[PDB]
PDB file of C-alpha atoms in Angstrom:
ATOM      1  CA  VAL A   1      -6.607  35.394  37.797  1.00 45.81           C
ATOM      2  CA  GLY A   2      -9.463  36.126  35.390  1.00 46.21           C
ATOM      3  CA  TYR A   3      -8.115  38.791  33.038  1.00 46.64           C
ATOM      4  CA  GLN A   4      -4.453  37.872  32.456  1.00 50.92           C
ATOM      5  CA  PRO A   5      -3.386  36.994  28.883  1.00 49.68           C
ATOM      6  CA  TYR A   6      -3.500  33.213  28.475  1.00 48.83           C
ATOM      7  CA  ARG A   7      -1.792  31.357  25.629  1.00 48.60           C
ATOM      8  CA  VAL A   8      -4.461  29.077  24.131  1.00 51.85           C
ATOM      9  CA  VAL A   9      -3.505  26.598  21.404  1.00 49.70           C
ATOM     10  CA  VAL A  10      -5.595  24.065  19.481  1.00 43.90           C
ATOM     11  CA  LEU A  11      -4.191  20.739  18.237  1.00 43.79           C
ATOM     12  CA  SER A  12      -6.727  19.235  15.832  1.00 45.83           C
ATOM     13  CA  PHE A  13      -6.350  16.013  13.851  1.00 40.56           C
ATOM     14  CA  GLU A  14      -6.977  15.204  10.187  1.00 37.98           C
ATOM     15  CA  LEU A  15      -8.865  12.036   9.203  1.00 39.35           C
ATOM     16  CA  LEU A  16      -8.987  11.233   5.479  1.00 37.84           C
ATOM     17  CA  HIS A  17      -7.981   8.531   2.987  1.00 36.33           C
ATOM     18  CA  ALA A  18      -4.264   8.936   3.653  1.00 36.63           C
ATOM     19  CA  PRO A  19      -1.628   6.837   5.538  1.00 34.07           C
ATOM     20  CA  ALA A  20      -0.354   8.000   8.976  1.00 33.56           C
ATOM     21  CA  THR A  21       1.745  10.970   7.707  1.00 34.02           C
ATOM     22  CA  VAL A  22       2.278  12.345  11.275  1.00 31.95           C
ATOM     23  CA  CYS A  23       1.544  10.433  14.541  1.00 28.88           C
ATOM     24  CA  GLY A  24       3.158   8.894  17.667  1.00 25.78           C
ATOM     25  CA  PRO A  25       5.824   6.268  16.800  1.00 27.17           C
ATOM     26  CA  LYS A  26       4.690   2.622  17.297  1.00 26.07           C
ATOM     27  CA  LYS A  27       6.713   0.664  19.923  1.00 28.62           C
ATOM     28  CA  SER A  28       9.452  -1.401  18.180  1.00 26.68           C
ATOM     29  CA  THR A  29       8.241  -5.059  18.205  1.00 30.79           C
ATOM     30  CA  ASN A  30      10.382  -8.208  18.041  1.00 32.34           C
ATOM     31  CA  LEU A  31      12.166  -9.266  14.853  1.00 33.53           C
ATOM     32  CA  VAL A  32      11.479 -12.726  13.419  1.00 33.33           C
ATOM     33  CA  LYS A  33      13.264 -14.248  10.425  1.00 31.06           C
ATOM     34  CA  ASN A  34      12.853 -17.346   8.236  1.00 33.68           C
ATOM     35  CA  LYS A  35       9.142 -17.481   9.122  1.00 34.67           C
ATOM     36  CA  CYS A  36       6.124 -16.659   6.955  1.00 33.12           C
ATOM     37  CA  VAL A  37       5.349 -13.274   8.513  1.00 34.03           C
ATOM     38  CA  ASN A  38       3.461 -10.201   7.297  1.00 35.95           C
ATOM     39  CA  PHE A  39       5.232  -6.832   7.283  1.00 37.00           C
ATOM     40  CA  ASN A  40       4.503  -3.244   6.216  1.00 37.00           C
ATOM     41  CA  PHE A  41       7.812  -1.536   5.416  1.00 38.31           C
ATOM     42  CA  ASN A  42       6.614   1.881   4.257  1.00 41.60           C
ATOM     43  CA  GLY A  43       5.448   0.852   0.788  1.00 41.44           C
ATOM     44  CA  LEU A  44       3.573  -2.452   0.864  1.00 39.34           C
ATOM     45  CA  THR A  45       1.780  -4.942   3.107  1.00 37.79           C
ATOM     46  CA  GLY A  46       3.603  -8.087   1.980  1.00 39.17           C
ATOM     47  CA  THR A  47       3.629 -11.578   3.485  1.00 39.94           C
ATOM     48  CA  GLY A  48       6.729 -13.739   3.267  1.00 37.95           C
ATOM     49  CA  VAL A  49       9.935 -14.941   4.855  1.00 39.31           C
TER      50      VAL A  49
ATOM     51  CA  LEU B   1      20.648 -21.853 -32.065  1.00 39.45           C
ATOM     52  CA  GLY B   2      17.432 -20.126 -33.100  1.00 41.86           C
ATOM     53  CA  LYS B   3      14.850 -22.905 -32.973  1.00 43.44           C
ATOM     54  CA  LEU B   4      15.753 -23.760 -29.368  1.00 43.60           C
ATOM     55  CA  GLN B   5      16.006 -20.133 -28.193  1.00 44.30           C
ATOM     56  CA  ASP B   6      12.749 -18.607 -29.462  1.00 45.71           C
ATOM     57  CA  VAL B   7      10.583 -21.186 -27.662  1.00 41.81           C
ATOM     58  CA  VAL B   8      12.161 -20.060 -24.372  1.00 45.18           C
ATOM     59  CA  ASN B   9      12.383 -16.321 -25.088  1.00 41.16           C
ATOM     60  CA  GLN B  10       8.726 -16.058 -26.140  1.00 42.35           C
ATOM     61  CA  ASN B  11       7.582 -17.898 -23.002  1.00 41.82           C
ATOM     62  CA  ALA B  12       9.757 -15.714 -20.760  1.00 40.32           C
ATOM     63  CA  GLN B  13       8.454 -12.548 -22.434  1.00 40.31           C
ATOM     64  CA  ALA B  14       4.849 -13.744 -22.061  1.00 38.09           C
ATOM     65  CA  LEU B  15       5.378 -14.438 -18.345  1.00 33.90           C
ATOM     66  CA  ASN B  16       7.040 -11.032 -17.951  1.00 35.97           C
ATOM     67  CA  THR B  17       4.026  -9.395 -19.588  1.00 36.86           C
ATOM     68  CA  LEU B  18       1.718 -11.344 -17.271  1.00 38.86           C
ATOM     69  CA  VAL B  19       3.667  -9.666 -14.475  1.00 40.33           C
ATOM     70  CA  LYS B  20       3.333  -6.296 -16.255  1.00 39.43           C
ATOM     71  CA  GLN B  21      -0.449  -6.643 -16.631  1.00 39.80           C
ATOM     72  CA  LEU B  22      -1.007  -6.302 -12.877  1.00 39.33           C
ATOM     73  CA  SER B  23       0.827  -2.946 -12.962  1.00 40.21           C
ATOM     74  CA  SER B  24      -1.958  -1.368 -15.059  1.00 38.88           C
ATOM     75  CA  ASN B  25      -5.184   0.137 -13.741  1.00 39.30           C
ATOM     76  CA  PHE B  26      -7.535  -1.065 -16.535  1.00 40.68           C
ATOM     77  CA  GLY B  27      -9.333   2.268 -16.267  1.00 43.21           C
ATOM     78  CA  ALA B  28      -9.476   2.288 -12.456  1.00 40.86           C
ATOM     79  CA  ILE B  29      -7.966   4.686  -9.914  1.00 40.36           C
ATOM     80  CA  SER B  30      -5.345   2.236  -8.600  1.00 40.49           C
ATOM     81  CA  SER B  31      -3.450  -0.872  -9.681  1.00 42.47           C
ATOM     82  CA  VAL B  32      -3.308  -2.959  -6.496  1.00 43.75           C
ATOM     83  CA  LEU B  33      -6.703  -4.082  -5.196  1.00 38.69           C
ATOM     84  CA  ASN B  34      -5.704  -3.440  -1.570  1.00 37.37           C
ATOM     85  CA  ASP B  35      -5.355   0.336  -1.993  1.00 37.60           C
ATOM     86  CA  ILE B  36      -8.936   0.930  -3.168  1.00 39.21           C
ATOM     87  CA  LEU B  37     -10.227  -1.324  -0.380  1.00 34.46           C
ATOM     88  CA  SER B  38      -8.204   0.554   2.246  1.00 32.92           C
ATOM     89  CA  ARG B  39      -9.133   4.015   0.933  1.00 34.09           C
ATOM     90  CA  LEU B  40     -12.743   3.376  -0.165  1.00 34.76           C
ATOM     91  CA  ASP B  41     -15.523   1.316   1.365  1.00 35.97           C
ATOM     92  CA  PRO B  42     -16.381  -1.921  -0.526  1.00 34.38           C
ATOM     93  CA  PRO B  43     -19.964  -0.807  -1.379  1.00 34.69           C
ATOM     94  CA  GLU B  44     -18.688   2.043  -3.566  1.00 37.04           C
ATOM     95  CA  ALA B  45     -15.473   0.349  -4.758  1.00 39.85           C
ATOM     96  CA  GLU B  46     -17.318  -2.529  -6.453  1.00 40.72           C
ATOM     97  CA  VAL B  47     -17.015  -0.913  -9.898  1.00 42.12           C
ATOM     98  CA  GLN B  48     -13.227  -0.544  -9.648  1.00 44.00           C
ATOM     99  CA  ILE B  49     -12.683  -4.100  -8.411  1.00 44.76           C
ATOM    100  CA  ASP B  50     -15.084  -5.378 -11.095  1.00 43.57           C
TER     101      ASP B  50
END
């Protein structure tokens, strides 16, 4: 149990001035319409109905 | 009519260019002010916002 070939992998993370290119998906929230609500749909953080 | 059309066309073009002016960097690294704030800390990004 001390000399068998073990498969060792390393999963490091990158932290720089970039958006979340690869990460766990956020839980889908509730949808609201006709209310002044902020959203971030992949290209902008815009506030509006 | 030319005298009634130019006074509207010039104003519309000026407003359109006001919209266009925010799409330029003015010598900075980004156009929108939110990107430099999100990617750089405000102490070093004071020159770009200025």
